[PDB]
Design a protein around this motif. Structure first.
Motif, PDB file in Angstrom:
ATOM      1  N   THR A 107       0.790  -1.219   0.000  1.00 37.50           N
ATOM      2  CA  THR A 107       0.000   0.000   0.000  1.00 37.50           C
ATOM      3  C   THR A 107       0.831   1.282   0.000  1.00 37.50           C
ATOM      4  O   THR A 107       0.658   2.130  -0.881  1.00 37.50           O
ATOM      5  CB  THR A 107      -1.014   0.009   1.160  1.00 37.50           C
ATOM      6  OG1 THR A 107      -2.014  -0.987   0.913  1.00 37.50           O
ATOM      7  CG2 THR A 107      -1.699   1.375   1.269  1.00 37.50           C
ATOM      8  N   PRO A 108       1.780   1.423   0.948  1.00 34.03           N
ATOM      9  CA  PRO A 108       2.583   2.648   0.959  1.00 34.03           C
ATOM     10  C   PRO A 108       3.343   2.925  -0.339  1.00 34.03           C
ATOM     11  O   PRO A 108       3.489   4.091  -0.750  1.00 34.03           O
ATOM     12  CB  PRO A 108       3.553   2.403   2.120  1.00 34.03           C
ATOM     13  CG  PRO A 108       2.786   1.502   3.022  1.00 34.03           C
ATOM     14  CD  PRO A 108       2.167   0.541   2.069  1.00 34.03           C
ATOM     15  N   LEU A 109       3.880   1.873  -0.948  1.00 35.45           N
ATOM     16  CA  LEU A 109       4.655   2.013  -2.187  1.00 35.45           C
ATOM     17  C   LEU A 109       3.758   1.989  -3.423  1.00 35.45           C
ATOM     18  O   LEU A 109       4.235   2.190  -4.531  1.00 35.45           O
ATOM     19  CB  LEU A 109       5.696   0.882  -2.281  1.00 35.45           C
ATOM     20  CG  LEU A 109       7.182   1.107  -1.972  1.00 35.45           C
ATOM     21  CD1 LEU A 109       7.390   2.242  -1.004  1.00 35.45           C
ATOM     22  CD2 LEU A 109       7.814  -0.161  -1.463  1.00 35.45           C
ATOM     23  N   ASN A 110       2.477   1.690  -3.228  1.00 35.68           N
ATOM     24  CA  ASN A 110       1.486   1.614  -4.306  1.00 35.68           C
ATOM     25  C   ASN A 110       1.865   0.562  -5.342  1.00 35.68           C
ATOM     26  O   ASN A 110       1.872   0.825  -6.541  1.00 35.68           O
ATOM     27  CB  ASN A 110       1.285   2.991  -4.968  1.00 35.68           C
ATOM     28  CG  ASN A 110       0.024   3.048  -5.826  1.00 35.68           C
ATOM     29  OD1 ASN A 110      -0.009   3.712  -6.873  1.00 35.68           O
ATOM     30  ND2 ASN A 110      -1.039   2.374  -5.373  1.00 35.68           N
ATOM     31  N   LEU A 111       2.205  -0.631  -4.859  1.00 33.86           N
ATOM     32  CA  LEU A 111       2.602  -1.761  -5.700  1.00 33.86           C
ATOM     33  C   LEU A 111       1.330  -2.462  -6.154  1.00 33.86           C
ATOM     34  O   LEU A 111       0.910  -3.469  -5.582  1.00 33.86           O
ATOM     35  CB  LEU A 111       3.474  -2.723  -4.884  1.00 33.86           C
ATOM     36  CG  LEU A 111       4.708  -2.081  -4.235  1.00 33.86           C
ATOM     37  CD1 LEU A 111       5.538  -3.125  -3.518  1.00 33.86           C
ATOM     38  CD2 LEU A 111       5.519  -1.396  -5.295  1.00 33.86           C
TER      39      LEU A 111
END
Length: 347
Positions: free
Chosen positions: A189-193
Motif C-alpha cells: 500500500t505505501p509504495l502503491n505496488l
C-alpha cells in the motif's frame, strides 16, 4: 557516484541467449533514474503463443525473503523485536537450541536444515507432490527439525528456506495478523505496488501473467506447466507475486531509505560472505559486478520462474529480469548477465 549507461544491445543479446537455452520467454526492465529501458523476447504461454511483456505478472520466489525482512526490520524499529533475542523467546519451544537468534535466522546462519532438499530431490515429482498442498508454518519447521542442524548457531552461511518460514511465524505471532496483511499495510500500500500480491494458498495469479515452465531433470524432457500452485511449501520464504516495475519500485525504495530507519537499513546490509563475489545481509543479497560496483537485491527461483531484482547502493537504478523457466542452470547463469549489461554497460 554515477553509473555507466545501460547497454540495451547487450541486454537484448542476453534474452535471446536465454531463449536458445530453453527459456520460453525472458524480459528485463531497468528504471535508470527516471529513464525506462524495457526489453522482452519470447512467449508468456508456450501453448497459446502469447508474447511475454514487461508488464506480465509472475511468481518472484525467493525475492519474497526481502519483503519478509522489511516487515521484521520495521518491527525492530517499533520496539517489538530485538535481532539478538533468541527465536525461542518469541516462539517458545520451537527450535531445539535457545541460542539461535533472530539475526542468525535472517542471515542464514542458524544451521536449520532446508526441508526443500527433501521435497525436491526429484524436480517434477516433488512439484507434483506439493503443488496442491497447504502447509502450516509448523509443518515445514517440523520437516526441517527431523534433521539435525548443519552448524553451530551463527557459525556459517547456509541458505535455508526454513529460516524465512520461521520469519513468517514470527511476524504473525508478534503482530497478531497474517503475513498477507502485514505485507499489504507495510509495503504494498505505501509504495502503491498495484501488481504485487500474496494470495496463499490460492493457485491463481491475478491479472495478465507469464506462465511458468518447469524444466524436467532429464535432458530433452517435455516442459511442465507449473504456473498454478499454492506455493504453500514456501509462503513467507517465496510466495509473493509481482511485476518488473513493482520490484524496481520496492528495491529502489529500500535502498533509498524509505522503508525503515537508517539504523535498521545498516543492519540489513551487514554482509556475511556467500562466495568471492557475493554477500548476504538480512534477507538481502549483495552481488559484486565485473566493473567494480556492487548491487543489492535478491534472486528468486520458484517452479517455472527465475527472477533477478537488484538496485544500486542509492536506489537510483534498479533492474528486474525474469525468464519463465526453472531447473535450467544455463538459463539461470545467462540471466545473471542482465546485471552486467544494466549496471556496467557496454564492455
Amino acid at each position: 557516484a554515477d553509473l555507466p549507461a545501460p547497454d540495451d544491445t547487450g541486454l537484448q543479446a542476453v534474452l535471446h541467449t536465454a531463449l536458445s537455452q530453453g527459456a520460453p520467454g525472458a524480459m528485463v526492465r531497468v528504471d535508470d533514474n527516471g529513464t525506462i529501458h524495457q526489453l522482452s523476447e519470447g512467449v508468456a504461454d508456450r501453448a497459446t503463443g502469447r508474447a511475454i511483456t514487461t508488464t506480465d505478472r509472475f511468481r518472484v520466489g525467493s525475492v519474497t525473503k526481502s519483503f519478509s525482512a522489511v516487515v521484521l526490520l520495521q518491527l525492530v524499529d517499533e520496539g517489538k523485536l530485538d535481532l539478538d533475542a533468541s527465536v525461542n523467546t518469541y516462539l517458545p519451544g520451537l527450535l531445539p537450541d535457545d541460542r539461535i537468534t533472530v539475526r542468525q535466522v535472517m542471515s542464514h546462519r542458524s544451521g536449520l536444515y532446508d526441508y526443500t532438499n527433501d521435497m525436491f530431490a526429484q524436480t517434477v515429482p516433488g512439484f507434483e507432490s506439493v503443488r496442491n498442498k497447504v502447509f502450516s508454518y509448523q509443518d515445514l519447521i517440523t520437516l526441517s527439525l527431523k534433521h539435525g542442524v548443519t552448524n553451530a548457531p551463527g557459525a556459517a552461511y547456509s541458505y535455508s528456506n526454513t529460516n524465512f518460514v520461521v520469519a513468517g511465524m514470527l511476524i504473525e505471532k508478534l503482530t497478531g495478523h497474517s503475513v498477507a496483511t502485514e505485507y499489504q499495510n507495510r509495503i504494498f500500500t505505501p509504495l502503491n505496488l498495484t501488481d504485487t500480491f500474496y494470495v496463499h494458498p490460492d493457485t491463481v495469479i491475478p491479472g495478465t501473467h507469464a506462465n511458468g515452465y518447469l524444466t524436467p531433470d532429464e535432458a530433452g524432457g517435455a516442459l511442465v506447466d507449473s504456473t498454478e500452485q499454492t506455493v504453500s511449501w514456501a509462503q513467507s520464504a517465496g510466495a509473493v507475486i509481482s511485476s518488473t516495475q513493482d520490484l524496481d519500485t520496492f528495491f529502489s525504495a529500500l535502498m533509498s531509505g524509505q522503508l525503515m530507519s537508517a539504523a535498521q537499513l545498516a543492519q540489513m546490509q551487514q554482509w556475511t560472505t556467500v562466495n568471492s563475489t557475493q554477500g548476504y545481509g538480512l534477507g538481502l543479497r549483495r552481488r559484486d559486478l565485473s566493473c567494480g560496483i556492487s548491487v543489492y537485491g535478491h534472486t528468486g527461483t520458484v517452479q517455472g520462474y527465475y527472477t533477478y531484482a537488484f538496485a544500486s547502493k542509492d536506489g537510483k537504478r534498479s533492474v528486474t529480469a525474469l525468464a519463465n523457466t526453472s531447473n535450467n542452470v544455463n538459463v539461470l547463469n545467462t540471466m545473471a548477465r542482465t546485471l552486467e549489461s544494466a549496471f556496467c554497460g557496454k564492455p
